[PDB]
Design a protein around this ligand. Structure first.
Ligand SMILES: NC(=O)CN1CCCC1=O
Ligand SMILES: NC(=O)CN1CCCC1=O
Ligand SMILES: NC(=O)CN1CCCC1=O
Ligand SMILES: NC(=O)CN1CCCC1=O
Ligand SMILES: NC(=O)CN1CCCC1=O
Ligand SMILES: NC(=O)CN1CCCC1=O
Ligand SMILES: N[C@@H](CCC(=O)O)C(=O)O
Ligand SMILES: N[C@@H](CCC(=O)O)C(=O)O
Ligand SMILES: [Zn+2]
Ligand SMILES: [Zn+2]
Ligand SMILES: [Zn+2]
Lengths: 258, 258
């Protein structure tokens, strides 16, 4: 039976094709996670259907209602068989869904407009002129909200109370804010998305400093789903055959313009 | 019941304390994986005993006999309940044991004596003056055995037939051979161990070029044992709390001598 795959529109993992209107089904989409879903499906031996997640979120649990939103939600509540996306493996998510071993490494990083007087996280903590935020419902926001560590715990104190809000709805919103703010706003986001943007015109942003942490993206399935086993084996095989490295180069760098 | 942990002596993961002679049991050893074992046992609430793996190897399958040796063998045949060591998550191993999510990242790298006229794998591949090899019964050697990638496959074709053998029993032996070969031997080994050695006296070796792949170390349990769930969740918590980052600086860079 056809596997229903939940994913998210995030460049350059899944993107609308130039002529998306004149194509049907899986043919409408392109990018890193679209190529990877075909590979996974082929080595696992299953047919599938790409679906963009209705609310455009990665997944968080609403503290009052306790309902999970985003892709995690689609898995938790039985709307999807699998998620193939830049979804971060975390402890609170591993408690309700299953993840395959990481297919991509990454860490929280800092994006600035070129020329901003900022070199690190500790530089961001002890200053007020330059504002900074993160994406609204993901692992990046929760890392800061959950952190005991100094610089980060103080950064959270700041962001949660900042006005107007320093959080954004989408990555594009974060980046557009960076570009328009003449260096008066820095954006905290995963190193992978920071690196992609740095290679796109107008070439006016850049990643500074080392990463604040170190984690991975995994293919997620409903807790105890049988599919888990085959897809984990598939990711390891495809890393070992060099597939994942080829794909990153194709979509990040063989694409450069800066 | 007391947990039998199988491990390997490999700096700076597990090493003998200076005054080992006068100490007993777990107190004999120190290092990154020694601290990580305390931490895992603390959070999971089990008592444990560290045991250095009998044959001194990581684990590979004899193609004639089909018997697994090393730490992998200890788990496969029931000599041990858990393996806490720099054990590489691979596809043939995940078929017979379980791995936690990665506690540390790394790739195959190149170690040269300072001054050796080599920057990359492609370099090594196109010449015979400088010999090169890897550890026995580990994941690096098997990386080169199963390479379809153009450059690596040629390197293996060279290595397997090379003579006298370019392969070594242990890391120390590999590193001693670099140091004593006046630049006529390069050693292929994980970036992690490479970066450690580069920081220690006599300070005569170095990591050149970029990593040849990208993979992870995982905590290993016999297939479908109950321990695995707890330890997986523990690794993720420990990464999320920054402890894994504390440990790596403690053992790697706080230790610098060059
Ligand atoms: N101790 C560390 O290396 C800390 N950092 C470096 C990159 C990301 C990670 O958590
Ligand atoms: N899934 C993860 O835990 C991945 N990361 C990044 C490197 C090691 C760490 O645990
Ligand atoms: N596109 C990617 O997944 C590239 N990388 C990151 C580590 C595993 C893989 O080969
Ligand atoms: N295309 C790549 O990223 C290849 N490399 C670089 C880091 C390790 C990996 O396999
Ligand atoms: N456990 C792994 O497969 C780890 N590695 C290194 C970075 C991501 C990749 O797949
Ligand atoms: N000691 C460590 O494992 C340090 N690093 C590497 C990736 C995970 C972690 O934060
Ligand atoms: N990868 C993140 C989304 C982006 C972010 O939080 O910065 C997640 O899965 O929650
Ligand atoms: N970490 C490797 C051993 C080191 C190597 O093969 O270079 C393994 O688990 O087999
Ligand atoms: Zn459109
Ligand atoms: Zn394929
Ligand atoms: Zn602790």
């Amino acid at each position: 039976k056809t596997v229903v795959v939940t994913t998210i529109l995030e460049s350059p993992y899944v993107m609308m094709k130039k002529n998306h209107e004149m194509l049907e089904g899986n043919e409408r989409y392109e990018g890193y996670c679209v190529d990877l879903a075909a590979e996974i499906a082929k080595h696992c031996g299953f047919k599938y259907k790409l679906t963009i997640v209705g609310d455009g979120k990665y997944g968080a649990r609403d503290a009052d209602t306790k309902i999970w939103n985003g892709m995690v939600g689609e898995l938790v509540y039985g709307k999807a068989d699998i998620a193939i996306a830049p979804l971060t493996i975390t402890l609170v998510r591993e408690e309700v869904i299953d993840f395959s071993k990481p297919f991509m490494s990454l860490g929280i990083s800092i994006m600035i407009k070129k020329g901003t007087p900022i070199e690190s996280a500790e530089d961001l903590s002890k200053q007020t002129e330059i504002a900074y935020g993160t994406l609204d419902s993901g692992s990046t926001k929760e890392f800061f909200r959950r952190s005991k560590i100094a610089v980060f715990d103080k950064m959270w104190t700041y962001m949660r109370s900042a006005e107007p809000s320093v959080f954004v709805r989408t990555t594009a919103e974060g980046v557009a804010r960076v570009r328009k703010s003449k260096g008066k706003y820095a954006y905290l986001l995963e190193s992978t998305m920071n690196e992609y943007i740095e290679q796109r015109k107008p070439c006016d942003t850049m990643k500074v400093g080392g990463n604040l942490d170190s984690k991975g993206y995994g293919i997620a399935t409903p807790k105890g789903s049988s599919l888990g086993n085959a897809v984990n084996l598939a990711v390891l095989k495809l890393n070992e055959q060099g597939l994942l490295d080829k794909l990153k180069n194709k979509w990040w760098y063989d694409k450069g313009e800066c």
